[PDB]
PDB file of C-alpha atoms in Angstrom:
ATOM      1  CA  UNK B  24      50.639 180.002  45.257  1.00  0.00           C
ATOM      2  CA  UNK B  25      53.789 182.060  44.755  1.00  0.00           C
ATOM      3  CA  UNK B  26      54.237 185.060  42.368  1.00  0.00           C
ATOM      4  CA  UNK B  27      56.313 185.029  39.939  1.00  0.00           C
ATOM      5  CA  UNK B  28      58.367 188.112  42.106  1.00  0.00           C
ATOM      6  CA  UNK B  29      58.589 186.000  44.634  1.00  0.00           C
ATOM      7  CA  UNK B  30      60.031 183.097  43.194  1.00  0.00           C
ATOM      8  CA  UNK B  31      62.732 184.746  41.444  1.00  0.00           C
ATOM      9  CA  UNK B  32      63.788 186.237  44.774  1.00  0.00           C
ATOM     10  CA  UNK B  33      64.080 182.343  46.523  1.00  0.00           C
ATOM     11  CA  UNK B  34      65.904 181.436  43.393  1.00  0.00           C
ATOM     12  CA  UNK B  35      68.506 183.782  43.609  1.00  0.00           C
ATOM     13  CA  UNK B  36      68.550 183.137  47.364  1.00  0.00           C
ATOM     14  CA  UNK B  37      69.503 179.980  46.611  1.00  0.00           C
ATOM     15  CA  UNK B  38      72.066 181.184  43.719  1.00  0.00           C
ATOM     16  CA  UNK B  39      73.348 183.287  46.146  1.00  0.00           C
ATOM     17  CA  UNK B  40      74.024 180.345  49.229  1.00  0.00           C
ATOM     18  CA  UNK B  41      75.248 177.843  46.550  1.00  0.00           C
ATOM     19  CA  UNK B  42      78.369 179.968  46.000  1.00  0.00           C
ATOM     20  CA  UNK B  43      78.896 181.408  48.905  1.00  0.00           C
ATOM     21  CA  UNK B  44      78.831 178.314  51.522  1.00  0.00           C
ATOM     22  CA  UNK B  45      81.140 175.584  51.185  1.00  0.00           C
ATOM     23  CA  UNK B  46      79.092 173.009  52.899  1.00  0.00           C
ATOM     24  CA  UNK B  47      82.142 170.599  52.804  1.00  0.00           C
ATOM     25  CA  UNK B  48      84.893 173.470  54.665  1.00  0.00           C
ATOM     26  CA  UNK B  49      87.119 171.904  52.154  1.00  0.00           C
ATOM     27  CA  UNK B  50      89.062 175.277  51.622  1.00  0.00           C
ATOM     28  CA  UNK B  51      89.898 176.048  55.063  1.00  0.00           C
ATOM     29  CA  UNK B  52      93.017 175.490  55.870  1.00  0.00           C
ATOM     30  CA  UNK B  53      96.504 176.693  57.456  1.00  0.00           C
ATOM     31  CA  UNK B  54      93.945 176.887  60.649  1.00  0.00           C
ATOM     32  CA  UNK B  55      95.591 177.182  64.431  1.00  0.00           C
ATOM     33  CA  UNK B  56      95.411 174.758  66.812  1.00  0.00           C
ATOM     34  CA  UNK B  57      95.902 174.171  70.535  1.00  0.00           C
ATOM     35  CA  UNK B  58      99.508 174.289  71.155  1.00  0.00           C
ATOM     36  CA  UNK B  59     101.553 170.697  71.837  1.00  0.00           C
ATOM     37  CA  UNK B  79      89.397 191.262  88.804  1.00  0.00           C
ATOM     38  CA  UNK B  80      88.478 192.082  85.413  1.00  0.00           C
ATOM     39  CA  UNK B  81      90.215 188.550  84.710  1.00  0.00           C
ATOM     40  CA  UNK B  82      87.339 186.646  87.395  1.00  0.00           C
ATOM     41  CA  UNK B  83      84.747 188.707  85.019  1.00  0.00           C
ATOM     42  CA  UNK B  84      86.413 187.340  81.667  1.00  0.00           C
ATOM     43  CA  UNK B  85      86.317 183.729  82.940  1.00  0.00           C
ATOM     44  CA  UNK B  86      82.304 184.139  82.380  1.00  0.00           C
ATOM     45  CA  UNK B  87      82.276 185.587  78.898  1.00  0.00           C
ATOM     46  CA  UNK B  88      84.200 182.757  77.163  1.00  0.00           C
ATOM     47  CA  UNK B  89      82.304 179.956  75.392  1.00  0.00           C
ATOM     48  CA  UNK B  90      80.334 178.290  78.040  1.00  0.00           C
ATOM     49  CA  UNK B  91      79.743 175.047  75.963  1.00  0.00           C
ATOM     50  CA  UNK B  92      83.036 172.837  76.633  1.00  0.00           C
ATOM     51  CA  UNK B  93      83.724 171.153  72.991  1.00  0.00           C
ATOM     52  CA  UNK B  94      85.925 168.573  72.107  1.00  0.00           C
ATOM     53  CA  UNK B  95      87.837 168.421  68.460  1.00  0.00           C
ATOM     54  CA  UNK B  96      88.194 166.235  65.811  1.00  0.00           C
ATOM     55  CA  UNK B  97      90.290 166.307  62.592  1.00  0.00           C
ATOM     56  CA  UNK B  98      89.666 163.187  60.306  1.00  0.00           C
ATOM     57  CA  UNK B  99      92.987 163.375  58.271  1.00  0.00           C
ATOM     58  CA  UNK B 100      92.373 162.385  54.832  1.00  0.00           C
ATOM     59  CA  UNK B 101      94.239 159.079  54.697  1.00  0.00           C
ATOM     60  CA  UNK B 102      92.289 157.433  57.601  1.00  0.00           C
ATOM     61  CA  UNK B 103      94.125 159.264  60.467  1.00  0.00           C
ATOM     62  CA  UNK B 104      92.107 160.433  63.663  1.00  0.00           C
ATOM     63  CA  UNK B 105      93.272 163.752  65.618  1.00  0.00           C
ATOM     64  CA  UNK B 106      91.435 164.539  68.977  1.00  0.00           C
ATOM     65  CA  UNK B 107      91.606 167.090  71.103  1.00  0.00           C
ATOM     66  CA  UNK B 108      90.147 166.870  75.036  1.00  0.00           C
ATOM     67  CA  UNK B 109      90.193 170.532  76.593  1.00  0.00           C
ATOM     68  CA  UNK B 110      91.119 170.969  80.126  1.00  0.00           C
ATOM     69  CA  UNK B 111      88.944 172.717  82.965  1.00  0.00           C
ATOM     70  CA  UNK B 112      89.683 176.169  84.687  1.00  0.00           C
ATOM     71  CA  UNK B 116      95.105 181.631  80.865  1.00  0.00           C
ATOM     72  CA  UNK B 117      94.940 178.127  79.521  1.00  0.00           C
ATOM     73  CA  UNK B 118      91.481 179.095  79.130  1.00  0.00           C
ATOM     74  CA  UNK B 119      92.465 181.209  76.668  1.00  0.00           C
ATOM     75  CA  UNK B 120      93.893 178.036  74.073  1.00  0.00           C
ATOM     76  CA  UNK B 121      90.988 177.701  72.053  1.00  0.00           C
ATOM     77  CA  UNK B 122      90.605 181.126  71.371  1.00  0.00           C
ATOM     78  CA  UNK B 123      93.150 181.389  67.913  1.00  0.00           C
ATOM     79  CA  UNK B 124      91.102 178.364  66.464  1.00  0.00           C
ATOM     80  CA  UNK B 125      87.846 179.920  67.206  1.00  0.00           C
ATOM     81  CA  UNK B 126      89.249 183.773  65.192  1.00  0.00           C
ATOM     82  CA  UNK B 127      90.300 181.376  62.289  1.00  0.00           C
ATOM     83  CA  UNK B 128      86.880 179.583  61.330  1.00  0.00           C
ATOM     84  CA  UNK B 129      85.128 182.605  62.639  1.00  0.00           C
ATOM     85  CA  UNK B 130      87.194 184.473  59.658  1.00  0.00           C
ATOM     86  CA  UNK B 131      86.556 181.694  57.316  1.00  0.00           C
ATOM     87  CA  UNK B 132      82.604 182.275  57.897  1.00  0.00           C
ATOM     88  CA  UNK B 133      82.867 185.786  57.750  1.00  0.00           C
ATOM     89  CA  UNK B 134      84.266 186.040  54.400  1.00  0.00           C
ATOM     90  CA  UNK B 135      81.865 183.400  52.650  1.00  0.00           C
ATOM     91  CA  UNK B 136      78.534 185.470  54.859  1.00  0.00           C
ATOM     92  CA  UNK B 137      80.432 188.654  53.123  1.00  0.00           C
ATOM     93  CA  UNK B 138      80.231 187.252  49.393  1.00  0.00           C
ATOM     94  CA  UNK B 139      76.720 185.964  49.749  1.00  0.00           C
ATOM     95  CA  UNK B 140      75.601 189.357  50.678  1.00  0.00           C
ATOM     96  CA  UNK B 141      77.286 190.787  47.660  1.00  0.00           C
ATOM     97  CA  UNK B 142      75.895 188.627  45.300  1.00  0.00           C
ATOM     98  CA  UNK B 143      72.119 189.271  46.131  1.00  0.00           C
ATOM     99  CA  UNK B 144      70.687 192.360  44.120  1.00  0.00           C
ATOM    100  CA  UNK B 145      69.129 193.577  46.836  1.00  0.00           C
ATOM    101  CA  UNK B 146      71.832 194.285  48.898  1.00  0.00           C
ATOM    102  CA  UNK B 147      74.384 195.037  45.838  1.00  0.00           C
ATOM    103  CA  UNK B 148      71.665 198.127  45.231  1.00  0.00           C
ATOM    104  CA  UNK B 149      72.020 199.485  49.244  1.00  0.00           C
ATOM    105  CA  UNK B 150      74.246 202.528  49.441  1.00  0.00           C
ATOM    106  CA  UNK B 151      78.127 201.114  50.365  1.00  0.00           C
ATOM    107  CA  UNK B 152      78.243 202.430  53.711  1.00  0.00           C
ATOM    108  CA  UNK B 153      74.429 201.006  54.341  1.00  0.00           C
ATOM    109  CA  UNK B 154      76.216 197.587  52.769  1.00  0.00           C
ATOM    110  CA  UNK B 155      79.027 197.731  55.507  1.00  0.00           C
ATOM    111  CA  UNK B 156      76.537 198.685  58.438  1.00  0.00           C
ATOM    112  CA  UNK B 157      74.258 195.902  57.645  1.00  0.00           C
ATOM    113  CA  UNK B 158      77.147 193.409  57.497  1.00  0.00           C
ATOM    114  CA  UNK B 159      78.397 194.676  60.885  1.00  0.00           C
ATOM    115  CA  UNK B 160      75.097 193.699  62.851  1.00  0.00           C
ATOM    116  CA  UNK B 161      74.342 190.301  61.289  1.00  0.00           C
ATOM    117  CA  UNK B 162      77.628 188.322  60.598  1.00  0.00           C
ATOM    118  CA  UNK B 163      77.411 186.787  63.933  1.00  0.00           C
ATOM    119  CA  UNK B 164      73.668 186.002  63.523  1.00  0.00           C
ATOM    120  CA  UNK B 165      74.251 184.390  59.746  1.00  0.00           C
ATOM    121  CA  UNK B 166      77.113 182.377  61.151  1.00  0.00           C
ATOM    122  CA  UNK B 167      74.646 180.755  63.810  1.00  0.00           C
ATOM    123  CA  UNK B 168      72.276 180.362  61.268  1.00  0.00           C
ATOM    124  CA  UNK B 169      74.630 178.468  58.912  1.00  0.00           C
ATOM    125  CA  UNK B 170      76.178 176.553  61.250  1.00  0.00           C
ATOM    126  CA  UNK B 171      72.778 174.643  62.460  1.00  0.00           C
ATOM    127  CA  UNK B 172      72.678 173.368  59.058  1.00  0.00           C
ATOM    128  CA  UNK B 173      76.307 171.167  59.825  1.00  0.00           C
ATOM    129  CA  UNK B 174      74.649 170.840  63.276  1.00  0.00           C
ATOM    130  CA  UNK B 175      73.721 166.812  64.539  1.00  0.00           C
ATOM    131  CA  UNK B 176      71.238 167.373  67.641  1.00  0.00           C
ATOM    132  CA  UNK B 177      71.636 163.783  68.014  1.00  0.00           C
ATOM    133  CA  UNK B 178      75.315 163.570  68.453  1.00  0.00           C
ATOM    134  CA  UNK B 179      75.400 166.950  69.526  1.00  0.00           C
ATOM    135  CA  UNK B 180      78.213 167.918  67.098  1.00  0.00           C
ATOM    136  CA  UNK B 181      78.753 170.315  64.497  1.00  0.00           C
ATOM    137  CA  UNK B 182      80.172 168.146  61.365  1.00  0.00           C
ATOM    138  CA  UNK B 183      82.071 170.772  59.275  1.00  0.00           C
ATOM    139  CA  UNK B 184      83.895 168.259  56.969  1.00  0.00           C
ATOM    140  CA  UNK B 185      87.102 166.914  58.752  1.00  0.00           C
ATOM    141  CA  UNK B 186      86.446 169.523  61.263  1.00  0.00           C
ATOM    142  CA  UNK B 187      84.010 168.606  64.094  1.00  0.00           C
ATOM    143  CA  UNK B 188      83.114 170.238  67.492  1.00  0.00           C
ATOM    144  CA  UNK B 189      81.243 167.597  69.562  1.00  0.00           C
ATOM    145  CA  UNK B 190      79.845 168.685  72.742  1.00  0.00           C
ATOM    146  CA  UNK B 191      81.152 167.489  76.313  1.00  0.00           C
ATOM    147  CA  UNK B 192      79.231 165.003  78.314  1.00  0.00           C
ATOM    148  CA  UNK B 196      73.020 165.742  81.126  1.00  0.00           C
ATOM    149  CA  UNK B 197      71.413 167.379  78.095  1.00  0.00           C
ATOM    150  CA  UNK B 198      69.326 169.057  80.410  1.00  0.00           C
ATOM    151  CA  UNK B 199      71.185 171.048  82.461  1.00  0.00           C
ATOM    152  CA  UNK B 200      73.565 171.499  79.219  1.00  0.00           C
ATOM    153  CA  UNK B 201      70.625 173.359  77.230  1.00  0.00           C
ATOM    154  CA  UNK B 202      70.270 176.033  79.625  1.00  0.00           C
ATOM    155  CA  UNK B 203      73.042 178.425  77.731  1.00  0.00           C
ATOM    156  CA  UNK B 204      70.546 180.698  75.515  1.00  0.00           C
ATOM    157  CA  UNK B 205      73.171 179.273  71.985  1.00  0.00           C
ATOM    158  CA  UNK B 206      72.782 175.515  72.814  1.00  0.00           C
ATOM    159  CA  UNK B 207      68.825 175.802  73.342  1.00  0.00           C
ATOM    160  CA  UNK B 208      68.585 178.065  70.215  1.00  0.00           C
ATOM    161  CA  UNK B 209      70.270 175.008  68.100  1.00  0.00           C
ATOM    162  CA  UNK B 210      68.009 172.356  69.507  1.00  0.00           C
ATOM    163  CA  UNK B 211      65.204 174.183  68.624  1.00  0.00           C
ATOM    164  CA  UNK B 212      65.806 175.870  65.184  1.00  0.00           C
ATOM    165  CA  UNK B 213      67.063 171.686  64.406  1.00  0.00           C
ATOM    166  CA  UNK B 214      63.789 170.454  65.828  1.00  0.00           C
ATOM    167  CA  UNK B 215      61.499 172.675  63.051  1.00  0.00           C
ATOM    168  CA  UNK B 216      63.581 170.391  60.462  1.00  0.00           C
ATOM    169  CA  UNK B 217      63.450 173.357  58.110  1.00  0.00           C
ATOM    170  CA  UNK B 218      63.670 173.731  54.377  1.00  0.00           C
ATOM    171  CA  UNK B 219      67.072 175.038  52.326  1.00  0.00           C
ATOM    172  CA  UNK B 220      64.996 177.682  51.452  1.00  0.00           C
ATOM    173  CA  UNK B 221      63.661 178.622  54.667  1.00  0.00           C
ATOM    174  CA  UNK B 222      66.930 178.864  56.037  1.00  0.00           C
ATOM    175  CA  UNK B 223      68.293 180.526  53.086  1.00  0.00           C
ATOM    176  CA  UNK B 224      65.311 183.529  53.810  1.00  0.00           C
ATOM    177  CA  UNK B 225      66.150 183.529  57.721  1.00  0.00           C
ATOM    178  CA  UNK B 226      69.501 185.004  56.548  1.00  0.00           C
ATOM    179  CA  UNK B 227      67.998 187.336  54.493  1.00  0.00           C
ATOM    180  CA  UNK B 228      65.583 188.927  57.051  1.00  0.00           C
ATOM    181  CA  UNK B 229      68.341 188.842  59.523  1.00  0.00           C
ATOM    182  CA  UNK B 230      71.130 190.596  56.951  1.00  0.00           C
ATOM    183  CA  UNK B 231      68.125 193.069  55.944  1.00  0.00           C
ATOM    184  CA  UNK B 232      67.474 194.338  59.623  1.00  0.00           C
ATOM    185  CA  UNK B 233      66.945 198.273  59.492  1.00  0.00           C
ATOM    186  CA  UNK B 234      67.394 199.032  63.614  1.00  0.00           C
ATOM    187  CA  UNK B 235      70.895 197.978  62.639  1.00  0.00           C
ATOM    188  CA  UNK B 236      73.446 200.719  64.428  1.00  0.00           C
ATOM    189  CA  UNK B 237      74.418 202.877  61.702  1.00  0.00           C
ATOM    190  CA  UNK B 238      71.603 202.417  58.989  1.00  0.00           C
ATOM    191  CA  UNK B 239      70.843 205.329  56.717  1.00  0.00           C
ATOM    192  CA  UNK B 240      67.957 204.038  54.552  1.00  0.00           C
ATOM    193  CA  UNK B 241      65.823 202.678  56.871  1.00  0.00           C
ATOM    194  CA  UNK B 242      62.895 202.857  54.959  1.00  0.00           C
ATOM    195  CA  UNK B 243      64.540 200.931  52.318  1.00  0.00           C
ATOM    196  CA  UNK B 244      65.803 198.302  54.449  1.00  0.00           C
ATOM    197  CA  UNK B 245      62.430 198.005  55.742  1.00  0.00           C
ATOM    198  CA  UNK B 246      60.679 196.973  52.660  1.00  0.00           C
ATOM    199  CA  UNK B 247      63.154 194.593  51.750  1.00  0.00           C
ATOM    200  CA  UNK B 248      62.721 193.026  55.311  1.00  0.00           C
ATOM    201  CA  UNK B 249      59.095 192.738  55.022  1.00  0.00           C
ATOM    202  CA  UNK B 250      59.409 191.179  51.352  1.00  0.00           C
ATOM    203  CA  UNK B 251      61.553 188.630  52.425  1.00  0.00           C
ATOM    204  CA  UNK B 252      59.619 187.806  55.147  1.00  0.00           C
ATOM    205  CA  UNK B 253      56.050 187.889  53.177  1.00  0.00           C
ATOM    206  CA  UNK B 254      57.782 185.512  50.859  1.00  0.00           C
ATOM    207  CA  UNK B 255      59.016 182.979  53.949  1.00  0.00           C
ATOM    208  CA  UNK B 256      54.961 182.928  54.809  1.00  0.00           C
ATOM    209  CA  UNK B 257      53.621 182.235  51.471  1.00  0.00           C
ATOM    210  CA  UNK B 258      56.283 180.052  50.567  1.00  0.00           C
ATOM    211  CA  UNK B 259      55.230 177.763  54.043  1.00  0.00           C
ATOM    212  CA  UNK B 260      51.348 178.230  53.290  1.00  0.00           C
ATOM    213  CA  UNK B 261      52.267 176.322  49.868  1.00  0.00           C
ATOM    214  CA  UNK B 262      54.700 173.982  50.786  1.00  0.00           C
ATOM    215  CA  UNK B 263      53.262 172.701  54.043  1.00  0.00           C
ATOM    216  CA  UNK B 264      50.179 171.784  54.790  1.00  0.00           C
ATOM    217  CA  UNK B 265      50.388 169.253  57.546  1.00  0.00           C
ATOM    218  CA  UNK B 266      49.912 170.107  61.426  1.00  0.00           C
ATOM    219  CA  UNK B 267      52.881 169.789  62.915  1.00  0.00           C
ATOM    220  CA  UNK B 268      53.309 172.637  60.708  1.00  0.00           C
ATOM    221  CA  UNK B 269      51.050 175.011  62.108  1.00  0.00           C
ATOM    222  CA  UNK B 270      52.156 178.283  63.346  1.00  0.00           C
ATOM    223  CA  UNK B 271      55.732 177.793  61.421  1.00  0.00           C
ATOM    224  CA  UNK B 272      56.317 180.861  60.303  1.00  0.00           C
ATOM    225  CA  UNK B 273      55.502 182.468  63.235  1.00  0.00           C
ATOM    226  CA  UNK B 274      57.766 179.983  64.936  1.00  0.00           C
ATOM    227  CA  UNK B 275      60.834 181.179  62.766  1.00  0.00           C
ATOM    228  CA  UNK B 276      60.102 185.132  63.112  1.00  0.00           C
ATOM    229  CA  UNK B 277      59.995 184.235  66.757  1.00  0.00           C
ATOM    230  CA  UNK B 278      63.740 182.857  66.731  1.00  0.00           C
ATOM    231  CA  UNK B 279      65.227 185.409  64.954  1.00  0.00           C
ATOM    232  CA  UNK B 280      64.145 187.673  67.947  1.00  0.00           C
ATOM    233  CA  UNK B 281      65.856 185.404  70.240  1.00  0.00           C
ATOM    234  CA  UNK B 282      68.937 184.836  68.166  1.00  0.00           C
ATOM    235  CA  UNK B 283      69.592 188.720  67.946  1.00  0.00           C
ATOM    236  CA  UNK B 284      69.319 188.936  71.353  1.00  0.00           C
ATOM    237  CA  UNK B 285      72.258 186.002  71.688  1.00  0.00           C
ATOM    238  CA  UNK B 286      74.150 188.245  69.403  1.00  0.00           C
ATOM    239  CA  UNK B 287      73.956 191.326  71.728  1.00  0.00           C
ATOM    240  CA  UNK B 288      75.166 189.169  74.507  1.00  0.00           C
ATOM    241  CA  UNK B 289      78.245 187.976  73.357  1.00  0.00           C
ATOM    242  CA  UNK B 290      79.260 191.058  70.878  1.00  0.00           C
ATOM    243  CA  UNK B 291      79.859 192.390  74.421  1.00  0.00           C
ATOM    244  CA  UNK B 292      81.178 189.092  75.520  1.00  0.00           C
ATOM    245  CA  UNK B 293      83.620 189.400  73.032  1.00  0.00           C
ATOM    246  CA  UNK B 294      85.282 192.928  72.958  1.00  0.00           C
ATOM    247  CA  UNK B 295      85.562 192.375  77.108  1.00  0.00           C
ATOM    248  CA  UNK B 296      87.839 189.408  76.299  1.00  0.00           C
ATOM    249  CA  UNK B 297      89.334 191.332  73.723  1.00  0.00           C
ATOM    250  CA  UNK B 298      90.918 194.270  75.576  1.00  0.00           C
ATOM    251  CA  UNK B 299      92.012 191.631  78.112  1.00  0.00           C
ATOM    252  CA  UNK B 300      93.047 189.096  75.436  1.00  0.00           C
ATOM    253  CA  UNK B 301      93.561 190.416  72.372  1.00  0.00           C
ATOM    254  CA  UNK B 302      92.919 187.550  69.533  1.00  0.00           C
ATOM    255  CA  UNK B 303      90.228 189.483  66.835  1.00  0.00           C
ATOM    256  CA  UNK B 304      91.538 188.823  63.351  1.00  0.00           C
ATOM    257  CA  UNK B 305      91.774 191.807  61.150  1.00  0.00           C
ATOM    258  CA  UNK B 306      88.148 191.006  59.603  1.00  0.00           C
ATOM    259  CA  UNK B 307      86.733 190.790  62.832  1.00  0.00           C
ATOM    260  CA  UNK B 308      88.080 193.840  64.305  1.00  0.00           C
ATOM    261  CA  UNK B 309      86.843 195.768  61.188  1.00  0.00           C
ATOM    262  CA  UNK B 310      83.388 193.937  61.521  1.00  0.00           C
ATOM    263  CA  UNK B 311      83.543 195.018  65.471  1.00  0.00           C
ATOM    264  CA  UNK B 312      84.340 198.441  64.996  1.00  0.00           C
ATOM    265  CA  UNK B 313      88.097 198.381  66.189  1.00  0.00           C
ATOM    266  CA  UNK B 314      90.245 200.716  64.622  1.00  0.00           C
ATOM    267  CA  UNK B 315      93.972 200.029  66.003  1.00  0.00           C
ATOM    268  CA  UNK B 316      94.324 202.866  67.761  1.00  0.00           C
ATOM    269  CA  UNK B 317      93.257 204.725  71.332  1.00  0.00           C
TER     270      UNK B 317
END
């Protein structure tokens, strides 16, 4: 029951994710690793999930990394710029490719990149995510989760993966989360609003008919409503910690140059 509009734009959706995400992280590499007051405030705007690490070496070897508990908290904190660089630069290509946003004024292109990098990143990464190992597999790479569940699921990121996991969603539906998140218009900095806009509602008019078509069973019901509801929640996640973030920052510096330019640091004052 799709129109032919509307099935060109999931198809180049797709284009767009196919050469943009490399779903086996086979080209990062040269990556840091854990080396072989204000400051009782920045203890509680680190990552509050403890994670464990795993590199599967390619002829059969097994590196793993236990972290230790509470500036040693501060270790992981290299390793976490470098893949967060390596996602930022594939999130910045797939926006470039789409027509849509190739069309958007250049300084509408970098304000619309600034307020949804984090989000895309989240949304990519539940794709690599196992809820039941709890453990994001990104090719050698993996972050498992320390050892319940329960009490675990209470950080607003953790319960957001367990859910968006549980609605077992489509490629294409997570392909057209992106897209409404990366097409936002109360982005800070946003100049054509109005054009934003109608590409936002597009996108998402195309997410509802595409789940009226594709789904008709009840454990379906409400789906798309479902997803519009989660990107609410995972923008305000993204709120939290982008001030999480530039408080550790000006404590502990560790942005990489793509990340201060996506965060609005200059280098100077």
């Amino acid at each position: 029951g799709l129109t032919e509009e509307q099935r060109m734009m999931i198809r180049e959706l797709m284009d767009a994710q196919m050469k943009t995400f490399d779903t086996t992280f086979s080209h990062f590499k040269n990556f840091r690793l854990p080396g072989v007051a204000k400051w009782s405030q920045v203890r509680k705007d680190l990552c509050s999930l403890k994670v464990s690490l795993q590199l599967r070496g390619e002829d059969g070897s097994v590196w793993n990394y236990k972290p230790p508990a509470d500036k040693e908290i501060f270790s992981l904190l290299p390793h976490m710029a470098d893949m967060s660089t390596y996602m930022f630069k594939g999130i910045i290509s797939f926006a470039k490719v789409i027509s849509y946003f190739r069309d958007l004024p250049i300084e509408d292109q970098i304000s619309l990149l600034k307020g949804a990098a984090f989000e895309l990143c989240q949304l990519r990464f539940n794709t690599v995510f196992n809820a039941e190992t709890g453990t994001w597999e990104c090719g050698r790479l993996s972050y498992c989760l320390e050892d319940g569940f329960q009490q675990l699921l209470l950080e607003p990121m953790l319960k957001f993966h367990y859910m968006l996991k549980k609605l077992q969603l489509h490629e294409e539906e997570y392909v057209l989360m992106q897209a409404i998140s990366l097409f936002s218009p109360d982005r800070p900095g946003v100049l054509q609003h109005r054009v934003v806009d109608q590409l936002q509602e597009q996108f998402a008019i195309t997410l509802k008919s595409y789940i009226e078509c594709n789904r008709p069973q009840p454990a379906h019901r409400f789906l798309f409503l479902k997803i519009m509801a989660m990107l609410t929640e995972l923008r305000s996640i993204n709120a939290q910690h982008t001030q999480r973030l530039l408080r550790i920052q000006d404590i502990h510096p560790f942005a990489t140059p793509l990340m201060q330019e996506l965060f609005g640091i200059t280098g100077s004052l």
